[PDB]
Amino acid sequence: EDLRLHLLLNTSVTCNDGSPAGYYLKESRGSRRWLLFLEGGWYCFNRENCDSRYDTMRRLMSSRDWPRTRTGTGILSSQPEENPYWWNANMVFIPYCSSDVWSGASSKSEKNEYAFMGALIIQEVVRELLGRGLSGAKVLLLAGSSAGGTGVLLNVDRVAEQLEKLGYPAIQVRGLADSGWFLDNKQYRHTDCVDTITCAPTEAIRRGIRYWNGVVPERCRRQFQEGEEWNCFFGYKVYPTLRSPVFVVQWLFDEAQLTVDNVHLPVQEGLRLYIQNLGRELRHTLKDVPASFAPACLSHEIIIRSHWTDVQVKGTSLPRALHCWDRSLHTPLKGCPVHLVDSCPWPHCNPSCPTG
Protein backbone atom coordinates (compact mmCIF):
# COMPACT_ATOMS: atom_id res chain seq x y z
CA GLU A 1 0.00 0.00 0.00
CA ASP A 2 2.72 2.40 -1.10
CA LEU A 3 0.96 5.55 -2.39
CA ARG A 4 -0.31 7.87 0.37
CA LEU A 5 -3.40 10.07 0.11
CA HIS A 6 -3.10 13.84 0.26
CA LEU A 7 -6.30 15.86 0.08
CA LEU A 8 -5.85 19.17 -1.68
CA LEU A 9 -4.85 22.00 0.62
CA ASN A 10 -7.00 24.27 -1.56
CA THR A 11 -10.32 22.82 -0.47
CA SER A 12 -12.21 24.90 -3.08
CA VAL A 13 -10.94 22.40 -5.69
CA THR A 14 -13.45 19.64 -5.13
CA CYS A 15 -14.93 16.38 -6.25
CA ASN A 16 -18.51 16.39 -7.55
CA ASP A 17 -20.13 16.63 -4.11
CA GLY A 18 -17.87 19.41 -2.82
CA SER A 19 -15.54 17.17 -0.84
CA PRO A 20 -11.85 18.00 -1.44
CA ALA A 21 -10.15 16.35 -4.37
CA GLY A 22 -6.67 14.92 -3.86
CA TYR A 23 -3.88 12.65 -5.00
CA TYR A 24 -1.93 9.60 -3.84
CA LEU A 25 1.85 10.03 -3.80
CA LYS A 26 4.89 7.79 -3.42
CA GLU A 27 8.04 9.87 -3.61
CA SER A 28 11.27 8.52 -5.04
CA ARG A 29 14.12 10.60 -3.64
CA GLY A 30 16.77 11.31 -6.25
CA SER A 31 14.55 10.51 -9.22
CA ARG A 32 13.69 13.56 -11.29
CA ARG A 33 10.94 11.65 -13.13
CA TRP A 34 7.32 12.24 -12.10
CA LEU A 35 4.38 10.14 -13.29
CA LEU A 36 0.93 11.70 -12.73
CA PHE A 37 -1.80 9.19 -13.59
CA LEU A 38 -5.43 10.16 -14.28
CA GLU A 39 -7.98 7.52 -13.32
CA GLY A 40 -10.90 6.82 -15.64
CA GLY A 41 -14.50 5.75 -15.18
CA TRP A 42 -17.04 7.07 -17.73
CA TYR A 43 -18.74 10.41 -16.85
CA CYS A 44 -22.18 11.82 -16.16
CA PHE A 45 -23.82 14.67 -18.00
CA ASN A 46 -27.11 15.67 -16.32
CA ARG A 47 -28.70 15.78 -12.88
CA GLU A 48 -30.52 12.48 -13.35
CA ASN A 49 -27.58 10.35 -14.46
CA CYS A 50 -25.18 12.07 -12.05
CA ASP A 51 -27.60 11.35 -9.19
CA SER A 52 -27.62 7.67 -10.14
CA ARG A 53 -23.81 7.63 -10.29
CA TYR A 54 -23.74 9.22 -6.85
CA ASP A 55 -25.80 6.32 -5.44
CA THR A 56 -23.69 3.44 -6.71
CA MET A 57 -20.38 4.91 -7.95
CA ARG A 58 -19.81 7.42 -5.17
CA ARG A 59 -16.02 7.05 -4.97
CA LEU A 60 -16.03 8.56 -8.49
CA MET A 61 -17.89 11.61 -7.13
CA SER A 62 -16.54 12.16 -3.62
CA SER A 63 -13.45 11.70 -1.48
CA ARG A 64 -15.41 11.02 1.72
CA ASP A 65 -14.74 7.26 1.54
CA TRP A 66 -11.27 7.20 -0.07
CA PRO A 67 -8.70 4.97 1.66
CA ARG A 68 -5.58 6.50 3.11
CA THR A 69 -3.33 4.45 0.79
CA ARG A 70 -3.38 2.70 -2.59
CA THR A 71 -1.05 0.10 -4.08
CA GLY A 72 0.76 1.18 -7.22
CA THR A 73 0.23 -1.32 -10.03
CA GLY A 74 1.51 -1.60 -13.56
CA ILE A 75 3.19 1.63 -14.62
CA LEU A 76 2.57 2.90 -11.06
CA SER A 77 4.49 -0.03 -9.52
CA SER A 78 7.84 0.66 -7.89
CA GLN A 79 9.05 -2.90 -8.53
CA PRO A 80 11.17 -3.29 -11.69
CA GLU A 81 9.75 -6.79 -12.09
CA GLU A 82 6.26 -5.31 -12.60
CA ASN A 83 7.30 -1.97 -14.12
CA PRO A 84 10.39 -2.27 -16.34
CA TYR A 85 9.77 1.26 -17.62
CA TRP A 86 9.62 3.76 -14.74
CA TRP A 87 9.82 1.74 -11.50
CA ASN A 88 12.05 4.36 -9.84
CA ALA A 89 9.88 7.39 -10.65
CA ASN A 90 7.90 9.52 -8.25
CA MET A 91 4.39 8.06 -8.51
CA VAL A 92 1.12 10.01 -8.35
CA PHE A 93 -2.38 8.55 -8.74
CA ILE A 94 -5.05 11.24 -9.16
CA PRO A 95 -8.53 9.80 -8.44
CA TYR A 96 -11.26 10.66 -10.91
CA CYS A 97 -14.01 12.29 -8.84
CA SER A 98 -15.28 14.95 -11.26
CA SER A 99 -17.20 12.79 -13.81
CA ASP A 100 -16.28 15.26 -16.57
CA VAL A 101 -13.50 13.50 -18.54
CA TRP A 102 -11.12 15.82 -16.64
CA SER A 103 -12.48 18.85 -18.52
CA GLY A 104 -14.56 20.73 -15.97
CA ALA A 105 -14.12 24.12 -14.36
CA SER A 106 -17.34 24.71 -12.40
CA SER A 107 -17.91 24.78 -8.64
CA LYS A 108 -20.93 23.57 -6.72
CA SER A 109 -23.14 26.58 -6.10
CA GLU A 110 -26.61 28.07 -5.81
CA LYS A 111 -27.22 26.98 -9.41
CA ASN A 112 -25.12 23.76 -9.57
CA GLU A 113 -25.89 20.60 -7.59
CA TYR A 114 -22.45 19.22 -8.47
CA ALA A 115 -18.98 20.61 -9.05
CA PHE A 116 -17.14 19.57 -12.21
CA MET A 117 -13.55 20.59 -11.60
CA GLY A 118 -11.42 17.99 -13.43
CA ALA A 119 -9.26 20.52 -15.27
CA LEU A 120 -8.70 22.50 -12.06
CA ILE A 121 -7.95 19.37 -10.03
CA ILE A 122 -5.04 18.60 -12.36
CA GLN A 123 -3.74 22.16 -12.12
CA GLU A 124 -4.03 22.17 -8.32
CA VAL A 125 -2.30 18.80 -7.93
CA VAL A 126 0.60 20.06 -10.05
CA ARG A 127 0.78 23.28 -8.00
CA GLU A 128 0.89 21.48 -4.67
CA LEU A 129 3.40 18.88 -5.90
CA LEU A 130 5.91 21.58 -6.85
CA GLY A 131 6.47 22.14 -3.14
CA ARG A 132 6.95 18.39 -2.64
CA GLY A 133 9.81 17.87 -5.12
CA LEU A 134 8.20 18.38 -8.53
CA SER A 135 10.09 21.68 -8.78
CA GLY A 136 13.22 19.59 -9.36
CA ALA A 137 11.72 17.38 -12.06
CA LYS A 138 13.19 16.86 -15.51
CA VAL A 139 10.20 14.94 -16.94
CA LEU A 140 6.55 15.05 -15.89
CA LEU A 141 4.62 12.28 -17.67
CA LEU A 142 0.87 12.92 -17.47
CA ALA A 143 -0.66 9.49 -18.03
CA GLY A 144 -4.21 8.17 -17.76
CA SER A 145 -6.56 5.36 -18.70
CA SER A 146 -9.98 5.44 -20.40
CA ALA A 147 -11.61 8.79 -19.50
CA GLY A 148 -8.23 9.53 -17.90
CA GLY A 149 -6.53 8.91 -21.23
CA THR A 150 -8.83 11.42 -22.90
CA GLY A 151 -8.03 13.67 -19.93
CA VAL A 152 -4.34 13.51 -20.87
CA LEU A 153 -5.17 14.75 -24.35
CA LEU A 154 -7.31 17.56 -22.94
CA ASN A 155 -4.83 18.66 -20.26
CA VAL A 156 -1.19 17.87 -21.16
CA ASP A 157 -0.57 21.19 -22.95
CA ARG A 158 -2.25 23.11 -20.12
CA VAL A 159 0.12 21.50 -17.61
CA ALA A 160 3.02 22.49 -19.86
CA GLU A 161 1.78 26.08 -20.05
CA GLN A 162 1.16 26.16 -16.29
CA LEU A 163 4.73 25.12 -15.49
CA GLU A 164 6.13 27.59 -18.02
CA LYS A 165 4.14 30.46 -16.50
CA LEU A 166 5.12 29.41 -12.96
CA GLY A 167 8.80 29.63 -13.94
CA TYR A 168 9.74 25.96 -14.50
CA PRO A 169 10.63 25.84 -18.22
CA ALA A 170 13.07 22.95 -17.63
CA ILE A 171 10.37 20.41 -16.75
CA GLN A 172 9.58 18.43 -19.90
CA VAL A 173 5.85 17.67 -19.91
CA ARG A 174 4.73 14.62 -21.89
CA GLY A 175 1.51 12.65 -22.18
CA LEU A 176 0.62 8.96 -22.16
CA ALA A 177 -3.01 8.41 -23.23
CA ASP A 178 -4.22 4.84 -22.66
CA SER A 179 -7.62 3.70 -23.99
CA GLY A 180 -8.80 7.29 -24.44
CA TRP A 181 -8.64 7.50 -28.25
CA PHE A 182 -12.27 7.14 -29.36
CA LEU A 183 -14.00 7.42 -32.72
CA ASP A 184 -17.18 9.43 -33.27
CA ASN A 185 -18.36 6.71 -35.64
CA LYS A 186 -21.72 5.22 -36.61
CA GLN A 187 -23.22 2.86 -34.06
CA TYR A 188 -23.78 -0.72 -35.17
CA ARG A 189 -27.39 -0.27 -34.01
CA HIS A 190 -28.75 3.28 -33.85
CA THR A 191 -30.59 5.09 -31.06
CA ASP A 192 -31.59 8.74 -30.88
CA CYS A 193 -30.41 10.49 -27.70
CA VAL A 194 -33.56 10.09 -25.62
CA ASP A 195 -31.92 8.96 -22.35
CA THR A 196 -28.50 8.02 -20.96
CA ILE A 197 -28.19 4.61 -22.63
CA THR A 198 -29.42 5.78 -26.05
CA CYS A 199 -27.26 8.95 -26.08
CA ALA A 200 -24.20 8.52 -28.32
CA PRO A 201 -20.81 9.87 -27.18
CA THR A 202 -20.87 13.03 -29.32
CA GLU A 203 -24.25 14.07 -27.90
CA ALA A 204 -23.46 13.18 -24.28
CA ILE A 205 -20.19 15.14 -24.45
CA ARG A 206 -21.99 18.05 -26.13
CA ARG A 207 -24.40 18.12 -23.18
CA GLY A 208 -21.63 17.46 -20.65
CA ILE A 209 -19.50 20.40 -21.80
CA ARG A 210 -22.37 22.81 -21.08
CA TYR A 211 -23.27 20.99 -17.84
CA TRP A 212 -19.63 20.88 -16.66
CA ASN A 213 -18.38 24.18 -18.04
CA GLY A 214 -15.90 21.95 -19.84
CA VAL A 215 -12.70 23.31 -21.35
CA VAL A 216 -10.57 22.01 -24.21
CA PRO A 217 -7.04 22.79 -25.45
CA GLU A 218 -6.77 26.27 -26.92
CA ARG A 219 -5.59 25.44 -30.44
CA CYS A 220 -8.29 22.80 -30.82
CA ARG A 221 -10.90 25.21 -29.47
CA ARG A 222 -9.79 27.80 -32.03
CA GLN A 223 -10.20 25.31 -34.88
CA PHE A 224 -13.66 24.02 -33.97
CA GLN A 225 -15.01 27.20 -32.33
CA GLU A 226 -17.99 27.86 -30.10
CA GLY A 227 -20.54 25.08 -29.77
CA GLU A 228 -18.23 22.54 -31.45
CA GLU A 229 -15.71 21.98 -28.64
CA TRP A 230 -16.99 18.40 -28.27
CA ASN A 231 -14.76 17.57 -31.26
CA CYS A 232 -11.71 18.07 -29.05
CA PHE A 233 -12.64 15.04 -26.90
CA PHE A 234 -11.84 12.80 -29.89
CA GLY A 235 -8.16 11.90 -30.02
CA TYR A 236 -7.67 11.96 -33.78
CA LYS A 237 -8.99 15.56 -33.86
CA VAL A 238 -7.28 16.97 -30.76
CA TYR A 239 -3.91 15.19 -31.06
CA PRO A 240 -2.68 17.14 -34.14
CA THR A 241 -3.21 20.40 -32.22
CA LEU A 242 -1.01 19.38 -29.25
CA ARG A 243 2.55 20.58 -28.69
CA SER A 244 3.64 18.18 -25.92
CA PRO A 245 4.90 14.73 -26.99
CA VAL A 246 2.07 12.23 -26.47
CA PHE A 247 2.34 8.45 -26.65
CA VAL A 248 -1.00 6.86 -27.58
CA VAL A 249 -1.93 3.38 -26.31
CA GLN A 250 -5.18 2.05 -27.78
CA TRP A 251 -6.64 -1.40 -28.28
CA LEU A 252 -7.92 -1.59 -31.86
CA PHE A 253 -11.18 -3.16 -30.64
CA ASP A 254 -11.63 -1.24 -27.42
CA GLU A 255 -14.50 -2.59 -25.31
CA ALA A 256 -15.72 0.91 -24.36
CA GLN A 257 -15.72 1.92 -28.04
CA LEU A 258 -17.76 -1.18 -28.84
CA THR A 259 -20.13 -0.41 -25.95
CA VAL A 260 -20.86 3.12 -27.18
CA ASP A 261 -21.27 1.58 -30.66
CA ASN A 262 -23.97 -0.77 -29.29
CA VAL A 263 -21.94 -3.92 -30.01
CA HIS A 264 -22.35 -6.82 -27.57
CA LEU A 265 -20.45 -10.06 -28.17
CA PRO A 266 -21.50 -16.72 -34.03
CA VAL A 267 -20.75 -13.35 -35.65
CA GLN A 268 -22.58 -12.80 -38.94
CA GLU A 269 -21.45 -10.79 -41.94
CA GLY A 270 -22.80 -7.37 -40.95
CA LEU A 271 -21.15 -7.39 -37.53
CA ARG A 272 -17.97 -8.94 -38.91
CA LEU A 273 -17.66 -6.13 -41.45
CA TYR A 274 -18.47 -3.57 -38.74
CA ILE A 275 -15.73 -4.86 -36.42
CA GLN A 276 -13.13 -5.12 -39.19
CA ASN A 277 -13.96 -1.59 -40.35
CA LEU A 278 -13.56 -0.29 -36.78
CA GLY A 279 -10.08 -1.78 -36.49
CA ARG A 280 -9.12 -0.38 -39.88
CA GLU A 281 -10.45 3.08 -39.01
CA LEU A 282 -8.59 3.08 -35.69
CA ARG A 283 -5.40 1.96 -37.45
CA HIS A 284 -5.86 4.74 -40.01
CA THR A 285 -6.14 7.41 -37.29
CA LEU A 286 -2.83 6.23 -35.77
CA LYS A 287 -0.86 6.06 -39.04
CA ASP A 288 0.77 9.47 -38.38
CA VAL A 289 1.07 9.11 -34.60
CA PRO A 290 4.81 8.38 -34.20
CA ALA A 291 4.62 7.13 -30.59
CA SER A 292 1.80 4.61 -30.30
CA PHE A 293 1.03 1.05 -29.21
CA ALA A 294 -2.17 -0.36 -30.67
CA PRO A 295 -2.68 -4.13 -30.38
CA ALA A 296 -5.43 -6.02 -32.22
CA CYS A 297 -7.31 -7.09 -29.09
CA LEU A 298 -10.77 -6.80 -27.58
CA SER A 299 -9.92 -5.28 -24.19
CA HIS A 300 -9.94 -2.00 -22.24
CA GLU A 301 -7.11 -0.14 -20.44
CA ILE A 302 -3.56 -1.47 -19.95
CA ILE A 303 -1.09 0.78 -18.19
CA ILE A 304 -2.04 0.17 -14.49
CA ARG A 305 -2.75 -3.56 -14.91
CA SER A 306 -0.19 -5.71 -13.10
CA HIS A 307 0.34 -7.87 -16.22
CA TRP A 308 0.66 -4.88 -18.56
CA THR A 309 4.10 -6.23 -19.58
CA ASP A 310 2.64 -9.29 -21.34
CA VAL A 311 1.21 -7.81 -24.54
CA GLN A 312 3.53 -7.27 -27.50
CA VAL A 313 3.16 -5.77 -30.97
CA LYS A 314 5.69 -7.00 -33.54
CA GLY A 315 7.60 -8.57 -30.65
CA THR A 316 7.88 -5.37 -28.58
CA SER A 317 6.17 -4.86 -25.23
CA LEU A 318 4.62 -1.59 -24.10
CA PRO A 319 7.24 -1.00 -21.37
CA ARG A 320 9.92 -1.44 -24.03
CA ALA A 321 8.14 0.91 -26.46
CA LEU A 322 7.87 3.53 -23.71
CA HIS A 323 11.57 3.15 -22.92
CA CYS A 324 12.32 3.58 -26.64
CA TRP A 325 10.14 6.71 -26.58
CA ASP A 326 12.23 8.06 -23.71
CA ARG A 327 15.38 7.43 -25.75
CA SER A 328 13.88 9.12 -28.81
CA LEU A 329 13.27 12.27 -26.71
CA HIS A 330 16.86 12.53 -25.47
CA THR A 331 15.91 9.56 -36.37
CA PRO A 332 14.75 6.05 -35.47
CA LEU A 333 16.54 3.72 -33.08
CA LYS A 334 17.96 0.32 -33.99
CA GLY A 335 15.73 -2.35 -32.48
CA CYS A 336 13.90 0.19 -30.28
CA PRO A 337 10.63 1.03 -32.05
CA VAL A 338 8.09 3.57 -30.87
CA HIS A 339 5.30 3.20 -33.49
CA LEU A 340 3.67 -0.22 -32.94
CA VAL A 341 0.27 -0.70 -34.58
CA ASP A 342 -1.08 -4.17 -35.36
CA SER A 343 -2.23 -4.74 -38.91
CA CYS A 344 -4.13 -7.99 -38.44
CA PRO A 345 -7.87 -7.42 -38.74
CA TRP A 346 -9.70 -9.35 -35.97
CA PRO A 347 -9.60 -9.32 -32.15
CA HIS A 348 -6.98 -11.72 -30.76
CA CYS A 349 -5.18 -12.09 -34.09
CA ASN A 350 -2.29 -11.00 -31.90
CA PRO A 351 -1.46 -14.06 -29.74
CA SER A 352 -0.31 -11.87 -26.81
CA CYS A 353 -3.73 -10.26 -26.26
CA PRO A 354 -5.09 -10.42 -22.70
CA THR A 355 -6.94 -13.67 -22.05
CA GLY A 356 -9.66 -12.14 -19.87
Ligand X SMILES: C=CC(=O)N1CCc2ccccc21
- Active site members: 146, 254, 300
Cα 81–chain centre separation: 24
Secondary structure class of 293 (helix, strand, coil)? strand
Contact in structure between 249 and 302 (CB atoms under 8 Å): yes
| 145-154: b (≥16 Cβ within 10 Å) or e | bbbbbbbbbb
Binding residues for ligand X restricted to 9-68, rule: CB under 6 A: 40, 42
Tell me the number of residues near ligand X by CB under 6 A.
Answer: 12
Tell me the number of residues near ligand NAG by CB under 6 A.
Answer: 5
Q: Rounded to whole angstroms, how far apart are CA atoms 140 and 142? A: 6
Residue 12's binding partner among ligand NAG, ligand X, none (Cβ under 5 to 8 angstroms by kind) is ligand NAG
Identified binder of ligand NAG from the candidate list 4, 12, 88, 288, rule CB under 6 A: 12
Secondary structure class of 139 (helix, strand, coil)? strand
Instruction: Give the residue from 151, 109, 148 showing the smallest Cα distance to 303.
Output: 148
Q: Which range in 17-25, 51-59, 105-113, 143-151 contacts ligand X by CB under 6 A? A: 143-151
Number of Cβ atoms within 10 Å of the Cβ of 267:
12
214 or 279: CB nearest ligand NAG: 214
Number of Cβ atoms within 10 Å of the Cβ of 243:
12
Q: Rounded to whole angstroms, how far apart are CA atoms 93 and 273? A: 39
> With binding defined as CB under 6 A, does residue 120 bind ligand NAG?
yes
> With binding defined as CB under 6 A, does residue 10 bind ligand NAG?
yes
**Beta strand pairing status for 246-249 and 292-294?**
parallel
Q: Minimum CB separation from ligand X for residue 53, in Å?
A: 13
> With binding defined as CB under 6 A, does residue 119 bind ligand X?
no
Q: Minimum CB separation from ligand X for residue 251, in Å?
A: 12
> With binding defined as CB under 6 A, does residue 177 bind ligand NAG?
no
Identified binder of ligand NAG from the candidate list 13, 160, 289, 324, rule CB under 6 A: 13
> With binding defined as CB under 6 A, does residue 182 bind ligand X?
yes
Residue 258's binding partner among ligand X, ligand NAG, none (Cβ under 5 to 8 angstroms by kind) is none
> With binding defined as CB under 6 A, does residue 15 bind ligand NAG?
no
Task: Mark residues 194-223: x for contact with ligand X by CB under 6 A, - for none.
Answer: -------x---x------------------
Q: Rounded to whole angstroms, how far apart are CA atoms 192 and 107? A: 31
Binding residues for ligand X restricted to 239-258, rule: CB under 6 A: 256
Q: Minimum CB separation from ligand X for residue 151, in Å?
A: 9
Per DSSP, what are the bridge partners of residue 165?
A: none
Q: Minimum CB separation from ligand X for residue 340, in Å?
A: 22
**Which residue's CB comes closest to ligand NAG?**
10
Cα–Cα distances (Å) from 130 to 242, 301, 315, in that order, read: 24, 29, 38
Q: Rounded to whole angstroms, how far apart are CA atoms 42 and 134? A: 29
Q: Minimum CB separation from ligand NAG for residue 284, in Å?
A: 39
Q: How many residues does the chain have?
A: 356
Contact in structure between 95 and 24 (CB atoms under 8 Å): yes
Secondary structure class of 67 (helix, strand, coil)? coil
Q: Minimum CB separation from ligand X for residue 138, in Å?
A: 30
Interface residue list for ligand X (CB under 6 A): 40, 42, 101, 146-147, 150, 182, 201, 205, 233, 256, 260
Interface residue list for ligand NAG (CB under 6 A): 10, 12-13, 120, 124
